[PDB]
């Protein structure tokens, strides 16, 4: 895929969810479908557990490598943390290539 990631023939199936409808007060019969419902919503918890397999880095480079590091000159707030308002901050995209390999 152009946007990155794994391309799958059969990816993690979609999980759909909905609130089962509950009819309001209906006093007479009609062949026309019910259109008045009790308004409602739901909430809950969801847990996702993923196992990932890793490929161990096996280099013979002598000198030290580049690493992703928390480097900020005079931070006004901690990055990747909630600020004074409670809203989560993120000031930079973190890619994936820091280690090197000879071609």
């Amino acid at each position: 895929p152009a946007m990155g990631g794994f391309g799958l023939k059969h990816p993690p199936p979609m999980m759909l969810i909905k609130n089962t409808p509950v009819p309001g007060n209906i006093t007479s019969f009609s062949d026309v479908p019910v259109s008045s419902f009790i308004t409602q919503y739901s909430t809950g918890q969801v847990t996702v557990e993923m196992e990932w397999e890793l490929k161990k880095e096996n280099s013979k480079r002598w000198n030290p490598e580049i690493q992703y590091t928390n480097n900020y000159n005079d931070p006004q707030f901690v990055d990747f943390a909630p600020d004074s308002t409670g809203e989560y901050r993120t000031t930079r995209p973190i890619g994936t290539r820091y280690l090197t390999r000879p071609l």
């Binding site: 280099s59 480079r61 002598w62 000198n63 030290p64 490598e65 690493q67």
Partner: protein
């Protein structure tokens, strides 16, 4: 054994195995004949205006192996791999070998 057979091989490496890491270093050393084979009694008086500099001792015709520096066992890159990932470390064992001598 004999003149035309090597008494050991070259090993430089680092083997990380979970809770342990094993470093190996091989170097080539040269040993001068010191003092022309004799012991001498060396000494000094007050040097640079300080008598803490005075001493009395002995030089010998022996030389010694000293591997008490971290860079004698760690490459810059393995050192980086250690300080970016572990909370501590301590030495467990030591094995030394002197071989391929040539006078």
């Amino acid at each position: 054994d004999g003149v035309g057979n090597a008494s050991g091989d070259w090993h430089c490496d680092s083997t990380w195995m979970g809770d342990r890491v094993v470093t190996k270093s091989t170097r080539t050393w040269v040993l001068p004949s010191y003092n022309n084979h004799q012991y001498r009694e060396i000494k000094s008086g007050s040097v640079d205006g300080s008598n803490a500099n005075a001493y009395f001792g002995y030089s010998t015709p022996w030389g010694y192996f000293d591997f008490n520096r971290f860079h004698s066992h760690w490459s810059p890159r393995d050192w980086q791999r250690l300080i970016n990932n572990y909370w501590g470390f301590r030495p467990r064992s030591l094995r030394v070998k002197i071989f391929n001598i040539q006078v």
